[PDB]
């Protein structure tokens, strides 16, 4: 019951979902052939969370992959764990968005979205009920930035009572991949802030920083980054899948994380990540786990968090640990970092516990803290956007498919207003 579907767009989202499904399959014990090979009874208790069933006893994932260009999807299908998906679910165009929002949101996407919406409706109506939509995509790429946001908009317009979760990899200025990245990033941020129930941004800059400093393996490739994103993913949904002492679904997470309607941006972090040279050396203890999961370096985004005080933060401990240790550590930390916690929302740390841990390790922790520090990414994006827009550079395409400067002015105004309202509470005092 209270099941969740997965729909992803763009190459980044495609890869991230392709890894997350592998992670979940390994966790539950699903072998590539689709026939169950788990060991324990609890390995099957909550198979309704992400899996539907067809005739013959095999399992399929409730995921619809959409990408305007066929190269990424074709490459993903033929590799490992590409045979679990229903080919009927696949949908794609034949043109290529060319990193252009106009193409991905007004001309091409508008026509291409019909089949995807129909299949999404069918999948949603098929099973018992619905609880939310988790969406993975990037704000920097044209096809994702357009189709993903339009799909979210239509989905909200069709379902008014279910939550939606979206993860986007915002482009940190240090390392860039597209010259027009700021345009699509800011415009997508605008289109999302109005209608996104939940969004938890992950920064590739902090990704690289952690994959260098913590693990200390010299030349990790895209696979490691995709994994860590996926593990962070599973950290937020393990609760809905396994039993424990205090369950906490996505709606409960929203209840305990969102103070106001206009604040639905979060930054996460996964622990522990131990270096191959020391894993036998580090000790496994609640004080160490808590100290790291509050460690600045452990979080997934480059936006410095000490530059502000958390509005509220919640954690989902995984594994077997006495609740008293968690509560005492939370009290001590809240006392020790008083200056770093707002002074009008007392008892502002959330707790949870899950019995069955992840695959192999004992205690696992996923952190989700909406810190006032998230201002920095939007501030830098706006700083580059103002300069880019002063000379109308690259604006003639964006005007070449019906979208005018009024839309850009509106989007920039909305983003700046969001930034202002977000900095408003930082100086607020009781």
């Amino acid at each position: 019951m209270r099941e969740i579907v997965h729909i992803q767009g763009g190459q980044c989202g495609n890869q991230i979902g392709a890894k997350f499904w592998e992670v979940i399959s390994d966790e539950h014990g699903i072998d590539p052939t689709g026939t169950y090979h788990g060991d324990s009874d609890l390995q099957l208790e909550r198979i309704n969370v992400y899996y539907n069933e067809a005739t013959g006893g095999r399992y399929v994932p409730r995921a619809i992959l959409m990408d305007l260009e066929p190269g990424t999807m074709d490459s993903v299908r033929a590799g490992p764990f590409g045979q679990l998906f229903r080919p009927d679910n696949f949908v794609f165009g034949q043109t290529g968005a060319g990193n252009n929002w106009a193409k991905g949101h007004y001309t091409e996407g508008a026509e291409l979205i019909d089949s995807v919406l129909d299949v999404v409706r069918k999948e949603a109506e098929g099973c018992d009920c619905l609880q939310g939509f988790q969406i993975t995509h990037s704000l920097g790429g044209g096809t994702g930035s357009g189709m993903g946001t339009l799909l979210i908009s239509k989905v909200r317009e069709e379902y008014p009572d279910r939550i939606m979760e979206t993860f986007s990899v915002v482009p940190s200025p240090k390392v860039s991949d597209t010259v027009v990245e700021p345009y699509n990033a800011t415009l997508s941020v605008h289109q999302l802030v109005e209608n996104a129930d939940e969004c938890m941004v992950i920064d590739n800059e902090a990704l690289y920083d952690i994959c260098f400093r913590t693990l200390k393996l010299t030349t990790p490739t895209y696979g490691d980054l995709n994994h860590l994103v996926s593990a962070a993913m599973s950290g937020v949904t393990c609760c809905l899948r396994f039993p424990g002492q205090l369950n906490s679904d996505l709606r409960k997470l929203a209840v305990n994380l969102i103070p106001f309607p206009r604040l639905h941006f979060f930054m996460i972090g996964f622990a522990p990540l131990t270096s191959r040279g020391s894993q036998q050396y580090r000790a496994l203890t609640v004080p160490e786990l808590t100290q790291q999961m509050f460690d600045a370096k452990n979080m997934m985004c480059a936006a410095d968090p000490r530059h502000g005080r958390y509005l509220t933060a919640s954690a989902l401990f995984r594994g077997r640990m006495s609740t008293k240790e968690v509560d005492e550590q939370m009290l001590n930390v809240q006392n020790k970092n008083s200056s770093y916690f707002v002074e009008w929302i007392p008892n502002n740390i959330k707790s949870s516990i899950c019995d069955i841990p992840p695959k192999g390790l004992k205690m696992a922790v996923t952190f989700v803290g909406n810190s006032t520090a998230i201002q920095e990414m939007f501030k830098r994006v706006a700083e580059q956007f103002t300069a880019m827009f002063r000379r109308k550079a690259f604006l003639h395409w964006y005007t070449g498919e019906g979208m005018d400067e009024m839309e850009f002015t509106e989007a920039e105004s909305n983003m700046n207003d969001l930034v202002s309202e977000y900095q408003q509470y930082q100086d607020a005092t009781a």
């Binding site: 693990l215 990790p220 696979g223 994994h227 192999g360 390790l361």
Partner: protein
């Protein structure tokens, strides 16, 4: 008998100047591929976490 003019043994026609060094014949013959190295692949990508041990 014309090549050893110090003008034919250098400045050839349609080809690189024949600066006769000697390659180590044990390599360089079949598919030896220049370069400093092939970006030596490290140990593990995923097994680093989830130690499976």
């Amino acid at each position: 008998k014309e090549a050893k003019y110090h003008s034919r043994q250098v400045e050839p026609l349609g080809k690189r100047m024949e600066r006769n060094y000697e390659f180590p014949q044990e390599v360089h013959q079949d598919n030896f591929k220049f370069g400093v190295a092939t970006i030596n692949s490290e140990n593990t990508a995923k097994e680093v976490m989830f130690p499976q041990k």
